[PDB]
Ligand binder design. Structure first.
Ligand SMILES: CC#CC(=O)Nc1cccc2c(Oc3ncccc3-c3ccnc(N[C@H]4CCCNC4)n3)c(C)ccc12
Ligand SMILES: CC#CC(=O)Nc1cccc2c(Oc3ncccc3-c3ccnc(N[C@H]4CCCNC4)n3)c(C)ccc12
Lengths: 363, 371
């Protein structure tokens, strides 16, 4: 059989999940949709739920709301039918992109003065492929038995920094492919209050991890004033493409070319530089060894610029050990996993300069 | 007072446009526009809605909400917009700080989306292109509508009058819309009722685009291809999007550098400089060293290759330059690239089609359309 409450329709046989409510797979205007059926004891709550959807669903990374239908008994809410929740996606295509999409959607809600107050993999939906094979993450259940993803300040009028904490956990959740910064499921919320966090799955030698935890650690700070805004998060190197990373290493190598070692830039750039270059970055390269100091971070950055700018007019032997765009920068980041994370945090002195505005965040 | 048909509701007093009639209505407490199709067109409406559903997920394609049947007539509810592109160019609406290039960019993006779904618009014109209400951030956008269906013409490609069309049809229509937006009312093929007849003939004119303004040289280069009488010579939607017509001032500058760097180690007798110098004297205004302002003249004036290099090292070594010269060139990257394009309005157009040999090299693939 099939139930009908106006334009919405669904078969009670097909249930998708569940307060005292149920969610069915149904139809609306011959679209595939997920229909949430709710009891009369939540109509005052649903009208507020639908209100939020009508205002905020005009963004690709926010779940698309179609229609609601009141009946003699239960009320119904039609949402875009999705492939899976983020929880199912992990507990059963590209991770950085989902987090970028998720964070983008989150940044959107914050810009409309809307706090999610309960961001977690269950609320993050993964669309069906869109005739071009593209899947995307979409926020939902925003602005409204255990926990595990709640900020410690919420043990009401929360600020945006709350959702950031929740996202920071989600970030580690997708990269770790299941883990959580504050431990196993039932253990999380208690460890959150106690500030017991662990990023064990992120190794210190892996480049991608050094970048990630630099971001996440800030996102899951116990002091809300230290967490970055959603827009801030999006600009972090964690989301940069390999071309952008390499372009960041090139632009910085230009700014330093006219800078003296007595300047505050090289001072911060060489601060703890001995560890970034692995004592001597010359001992961690063979064909590329023929350069014609080895403890200076600056020189390493000067090296990659030159070999990139002259990559065309370079020996096939050198071009071999070094492709042009992605494999080139991977030569350095892989052999010097702290290079980008260090270069990025040191060059923040130029965060206001036009040349670095696309790399750093400030209104 | 208020006609309610299922979920859709509207006051018949508020007619938005005209045998279908379009009212300002409501659906699910959303502001919407309601098209009332008559019983003699229920077969066409079912096709119209079908397209709206499959082609809904794109920010530059009109958003479709719901449809409600009724014994009197069918109803179709879409997003309520501020105005059609026509209304904007005609009259009032000439404000809101609207960027013409951004509208054409948005329009073309929506079109590329329709094409990728194997849909031909068959009738793209300013009346169809709707201008959204400003969002919470005061941003508005263009959205395509009335696409894929089978009162005068003027925006129709010449092949469709002489059974189904190809993507290149919508390109001709777009090319005319480009001119219409830039010229703020004009049309390559003349006045309203004159257009379609001029289209069957070869009677087109872009005289609003002068060869002096650097923007107009770019606009002309693109549009002329888009409105070509021969369909096989028209760019695809995604091809149009790659054109310099849409490049930012930063990307225009970033282009001259990747070009200059590429020709740095190149011989002046090669096939890549001779192409760059092919008619180079006119690009540099006989001698570019004379067209330069008094200050910058201090730091081969008949070679485009040297001009790119001159702009390159001027940028690469900008941080270390005189304050007087820094005033002449201007602030990077916007005012700095406009310093040269203003005085050499054929440089960009020249350098672009010249460097099209490296359209498969990855350093230039972002600048050129390819399979
Ligand atoms: C303010 C505000 C708000 C808001 O958003 N209120 C919601 C309305 C309707 C459904 C919702 C919703 O929906 C589901 N709630 C529980 C379980 C499953 C689904 C759901 C939704 C869409 N699609 C799918 N697809 C299935 C296919 C089989 C594999 N699992 C995923 N499931 C979620 C989560 C969250 C919020 C929902
Ligand atoms: C396949 C397929 C398809 C498809 O899209 N089928 C359409 C359905 C409903 C309305 C449409 C439509 O709608 C209008 N048709 C005529 C006149 C006005 C409007 C209209 C629509 C939305 N908003 C506004 N706002 C007014 C506000 C006052 C200034 N003028 C614009 N007008 C247009 C054009 C074009 C197509 C429409």
């Amino acid at each position: 059989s099939v139930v009908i409450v106006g334009k919405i329709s669904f078969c009670p046989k097909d249930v998708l999940g569940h307060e005292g409510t149920i969610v069915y797979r149904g139809m609306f205007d011959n679209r595939d949709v997920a229909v949430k059926r709710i009891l009369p004891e939540c109509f005052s709550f649903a009208d507020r739920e639908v209100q939020l959807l009508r205002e905020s669903d005009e963004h690709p990374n926010v779940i698309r709301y179609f229609c609601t239908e009141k009946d003699r008994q239960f009320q119904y809410i039609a949402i875009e039918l999705c492939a899976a929740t983020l929880q199912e996606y992990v507990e059963q295509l590209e991770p950085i992109t989902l987090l970028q999409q998720t964070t983008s959607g989150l940044a959107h809600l914050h810009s409309l003065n809307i706090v999610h107050r309960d961001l977690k993999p269950h609320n993050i939906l993964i669309s069906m492929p869109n005739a071009h094979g593209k899947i995307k993450a979409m926020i939902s259940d925003f602005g409204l038995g255990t926990e595990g993803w709640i900020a410690p300040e919420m043990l009401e009028n929360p600020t945006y920094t709350v959702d950031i904490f929740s996202a920071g956990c989600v970030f580690y959740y997708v990269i770790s492919e299941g883990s959580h910064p504050f431990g196993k499921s039932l253990q999380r919320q208690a460890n959150i209050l106690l500030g017991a966090c662990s990023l064990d799955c992120l190794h210190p030698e892996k480049h991608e991890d050094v970048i990630a935890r630099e971001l996440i650690e800030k996102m899951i700070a116990m002091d809300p004033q230290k967490r970055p805004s959603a827009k801030h998060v999006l600009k972090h190197p964690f989301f940069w493409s390999l071309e952008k990373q390499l372009q960041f290493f090139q632009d910085v190598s230009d700014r330093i070319e006219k800078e003296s070692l007595d300047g505050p830039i090289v001072k911060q750039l060489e601060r703890g530089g001995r560890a970034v270059v692995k004592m001597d970055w010359r001992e961690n390269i063979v064909p590329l060894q023929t350069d014609l100091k080895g403890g200076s971070v600056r020189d390493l950055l000067r090296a990659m610029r030159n070999k990139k700018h002259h990559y065309r007019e370079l020996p096939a032997e050198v071009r071999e050990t070094l492709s042009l765009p992605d494999d080139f920068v991977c030569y350095f980041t892989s052999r010097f996993p702290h290079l980008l994370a260090h270069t990025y945090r040191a060059m923040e002195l130029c965060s206001h300069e036009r040349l670095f505005q696309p790399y750093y965040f400030h209104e």
